[PDB]
Amino acid sequence: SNLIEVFVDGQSVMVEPGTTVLQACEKVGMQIPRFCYHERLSVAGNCRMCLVEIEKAPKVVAACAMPVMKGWNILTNSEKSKKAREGVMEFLLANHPLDCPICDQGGECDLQDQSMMFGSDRSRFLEGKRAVEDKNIGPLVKTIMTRCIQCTRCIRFASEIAGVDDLGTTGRGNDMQVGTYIEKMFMSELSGNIIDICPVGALTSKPYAFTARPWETRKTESIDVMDAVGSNIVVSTRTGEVMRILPRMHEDINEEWISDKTR
Amino acid sequence: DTRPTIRPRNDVVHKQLSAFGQYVAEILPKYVQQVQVSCFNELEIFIHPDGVIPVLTFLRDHTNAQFKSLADLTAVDVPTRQNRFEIVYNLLSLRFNSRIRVKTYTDELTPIESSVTVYKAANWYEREIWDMFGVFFANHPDLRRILTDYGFEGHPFRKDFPLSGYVELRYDDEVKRVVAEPVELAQEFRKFDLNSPWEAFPAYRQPPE
Amino acid sequence: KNFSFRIDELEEMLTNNRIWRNRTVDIGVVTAEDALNYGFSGVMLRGSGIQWDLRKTQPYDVYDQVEFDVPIGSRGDCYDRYLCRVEEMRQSLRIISQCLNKMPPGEIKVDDAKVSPPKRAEMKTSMESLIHHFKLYTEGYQVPPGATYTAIEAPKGEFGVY
Amino acid sequence: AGLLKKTTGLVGLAVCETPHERLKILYTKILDVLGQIPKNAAYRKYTEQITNEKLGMVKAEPDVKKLEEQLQGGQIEEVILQAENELSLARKMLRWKPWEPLVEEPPANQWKWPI
Amino acid sequence: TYKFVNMREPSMDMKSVTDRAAQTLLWTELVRGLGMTLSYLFREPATINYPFEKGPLSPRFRGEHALRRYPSGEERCIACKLCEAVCPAQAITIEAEPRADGSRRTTRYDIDMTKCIYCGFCQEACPVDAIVEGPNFEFSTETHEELLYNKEKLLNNGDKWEAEIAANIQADYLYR
Amino acid sequence: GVRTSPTGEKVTHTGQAYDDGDYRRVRFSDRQKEVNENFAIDLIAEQPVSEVGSRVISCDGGGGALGHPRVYINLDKETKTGTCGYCGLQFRQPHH
Amino acid sequence: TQDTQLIAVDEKLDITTLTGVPEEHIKTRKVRIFVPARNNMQSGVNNTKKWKMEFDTRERWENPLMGWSSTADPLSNLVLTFSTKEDAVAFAEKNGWSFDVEERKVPKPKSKSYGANFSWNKRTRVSTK
Amino acid sequence: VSMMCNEQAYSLAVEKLLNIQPPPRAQWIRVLFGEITRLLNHIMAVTTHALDIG
Amino acid sequence: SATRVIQLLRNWASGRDLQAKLQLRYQEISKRTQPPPKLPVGPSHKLSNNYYCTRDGRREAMPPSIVMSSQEKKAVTPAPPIKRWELSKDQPYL
Amino acid sequence: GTSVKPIFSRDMNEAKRRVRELYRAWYREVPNTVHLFQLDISVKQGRDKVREMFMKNAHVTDPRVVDLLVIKGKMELEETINVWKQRTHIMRFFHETEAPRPTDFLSKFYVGHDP
């Protein structure tokens, strides 16, 4: 076929036409940091963390949605790219509340891991952080909206995968909150995956709330039995008891979604 | 370094050790495989197992090397390799105040010629290594357990050996002397899989495979 | 200030004493070659006259700026080693004097918060300090792959870690 | 030269009263053992390339204290100690002739040590 | 630079040789140690009167653990488990539960001293200064089951030991 | 405040109480199942609720550096009173 | 390959008699290997790059005095690192452990087209970004 | 015998592998206490020697 | 802190002025009621121009450099011979 | 190739010899072992407790493993000559105080989830 030839950090890559920069780098084993974009959902480009310089780039191009053309070299470790990561990330850690000891994502938070890798060691914020009032979308999914990063990951899941269009954003500016504008029951039978979708502690499992921490839990691979699809899952076992049902990774069985009953 | 956080470098030493790295390579092309000096000025010689006693002899004897001090004996075990145990020596040259590292590879069954003749310090370091890892060396004077318990079976430092061990002991009055039994902990070792799921160093990343 | 008046107390008790000396001098000797052939270090070599000390030959930390002497034995026996140990204590006191009068201002840990925990005041106020403190005190700083054999001048010998 | 070295620093070894001659006879013995080695061998060339300066340097300088400073191998006593120590190397290098290519390539995986 | 330690050839002078001979025959350097030891005898002993008298300490001393609480009364611990993750001997075991109100602290907070190392790492690992290394070195006992505390006694220890640490962290909050 | 179990032993703050048929209770014989009298359940409810006039407030927990890390709680829900998870004390709008 | 009185001992390596793990822990232990799956809430697929060796979870009972998870099997927390699966099984054969192998669930190479988020007839157009 | 002489080696092992250096003031504290630590061993390296000696 | 007569006895039996400073401690020590400190900020505490990429020690470490692999010159030494130390100018013979 | 370098036993025959003088040392060791070591077990049960350990390893076909084990056999042997081990150390071979391990399927089912 076409199979346009591209480069990443100098190394040549054989990639298919129409692919994005992030997928092209993923071929060699490059996981560009990302918050808004997910594999199984449509590209949004709101995180702006994926911003990575390419060869001879007057302007940095977002790796989330950037069809890479012929003869393109991705400057993964360029100083401009690293400056891009630091700039947008500190912007993420501007109104985020000091809840790491409290938020259940601590130790398994995507945001936390990026900060040690692609982040500065100190802050410059000297003003008052924003605070978002909490909502309630189910007695199974804790809603703490002050930790939201407005990555619209939950928005796409409700519309595309879940199929119920009730979740979304509201307002504008810094007060661009994510919610429903009205007390609503998030009724999707596979809505439990919204906990895994959210990279932060904005959505937290109410039954699992304040129960365990990532490093002590022992992961064991298994398959659910409540349904006959056999959606394989992972059980989090700490000190000989089960607390959390982690959906597994199997393309032709369950992708990465499981029902709330299974979860 | 105008920045006071990162550690400085000694490029003069780094090249100088690299020059001696290739120096040994021509001297003993049969035994060395590849010689590498790390970024933090540590030049390591990688030699073949069967030629363990000559290279150590050469470094102890040669004027330009004069490495006569067996600093340490280590045999770091990596389960993913065919011959797991890689035996690492450690030498110091007093006259050139520099350190060299010569190392081989050896499975659980292959015996190595003991380097006690070339280094008397290897003697007790030899009694420890066979204890912890289980790699027997040949024609050692008195190769025998000097670390583990008298009759303690199994080399504890092996990867397959659990940290908690296999047996535990306890005094028993019905026999009026201590006695062993299978290990049964009051509290198990709670494993902490804390490794970050995000890449930490782009420089050391392996090529795609 | 008060300590230098105490090694003299030990040395008055022991060094000049014939009873200490007879049990000690020429009791246990090592030659030059078997000293470093057996892997000895520190006082064991220094008592045997071996001209080696890790602080001077391979300085580490700020030991290059300090100025001191290393006692070197002449017989390699027990009396020499004990005498070098006594003199090392006196030379240690001189290092304390230079260290005391040369303490520089500044911080106490590397400003890189990814390797050292941030200050408590910043950890309770700033985001980056808190999130780093959480992950540093739950994962630890990621050390790059490699190997090293840093060895310092231990009071006995060349205590090091591979 | 000068008055005889009463002590040789390092204990156990004995001060030699014939330094220059001992260096001469030892260095010639170094070259003698170097004779029965192919000239293409690195070890022969390397040691010959250092002993030629070493042998001519003692043969030129008649003062042992100056010879200490010139060679910078410390006192003569350890210089002759290593010269005979190197003599064992050259003699017994003949039994591990290294000049031929290596035994075999390493079985791949033992290198590349990030896992 | 180095200093030679042991070589001083004694003079063979008549005065010097009779010095060594007098030193040998008449024990003189031998009585020197004997004589000074007399001088040190008259020194008053440097012994404290335990328990009537106790040795000097410092505010940053590590002793028995004591879980403190806020001035209102709510216990500081918020079950972040950082102390458990850092504890070099895994002396901490933590379980948590959201109970009814703003007081979900621990289902279980067991600190195992006979396993603990007294490194104090839990103290500075705590983001809310909940677990602290108390200033009491004096908590010995006769039974092995005693040397472990439950969550309750940690609270009782923090309740019983409260004035000392409150002032200790008051003086040491800037250093750490 | 501490209650008493039907077997005559005081209940702990977490609600744990040894069953009457339980055998491991005998550890309490000639000893005590001591219970922290200051129940965190009853040690925070009676604290007064503040009436600050602002949308968002930084709660420190008192003492500045000595308190819990500063947390920006929100007061917009009129039915519910705001609170800091670290401390648990209440916050409220000025009656709006 | 190095001829030093070489004999053709090509039988499968059996180091179990030398390592001497107890009989209950050499036969009655189903040793299983896989590649660990990435945590779903994380986006850390790089942790799915290494073959990992595991064991079977045995009894985990509660301590009477406190309530613990006291274990009787020494091989409870033991996990081993392997670059490729053939090395992992090779360790199993020499250590005579009953081995089970899973495969590396490589991701499907999905095609992402942001232009498809705004189409004229295709349903893939997004109602809210 | 030597409390912080040891982790001084261990500390030097890690941050030097980490390509990180300590602040200049910290190194002065390390060497000052390392010398105090050097005094610590030598105190009973000689006296406990004399204890077994008599 | 004793009688003068025994002070002469201790000073003469030991032959040294012990009374100038003694093993035990007295009020010359610093009081344990220190004023609050004002610990300094670090070099990287600059409010601007503090990008991590310019001071990243961990990321600036390269893999171990390789010079020769299995797949007229001059003979060298790992380092120049160690300089012979000079006697202690303060005091060269104990 | 798959060919390997033996240490002492080139094949089964010499390895069979090496296990034989282990018996030669052990058989005359057990009597005075009980005598010197203050043991209360007789020679009769001492002899066959050396026996069954030969069948404890009577399945290995690799000469190296037999050779890797022959060194340990004389190691525990030598450890017993010079009273280095203590009474409990050799008692550990005499499995005496542990509860008997269940064998039939009914027993482990009645004991617990042990497979």
Ligand code: SF4
């Ligand atoms: S979501 Fe992540 S960064 Fe935010 S509070 Fe929770 S752990 Fe911390």
Ligand code: SF4
């Ligand atoms: S609630 Fe979570 S998933 Fe939804 S936009 Fe905010 S951060 Fe993203």
Ligand code: SF4
């Ligand atoms: S000092 Fe604290 S952190 Fe360290 S082991 Fe003891 S309780 Fe755990």
Ligand code: SF4
């Ligand atoms: S004591 Fe402190 S560190 Fe430990 S769980 Fe409680 S709040 Fe967290």
Ligand code: FES
């Ligand atoms: S991937 Fe481009 S912003 Fe999330």
Ligand SMILES: [K+]
């Ligand atoms: K989430």
Ligand SMILES: [Zn+2]
């Ligand atoms: Zn609060």
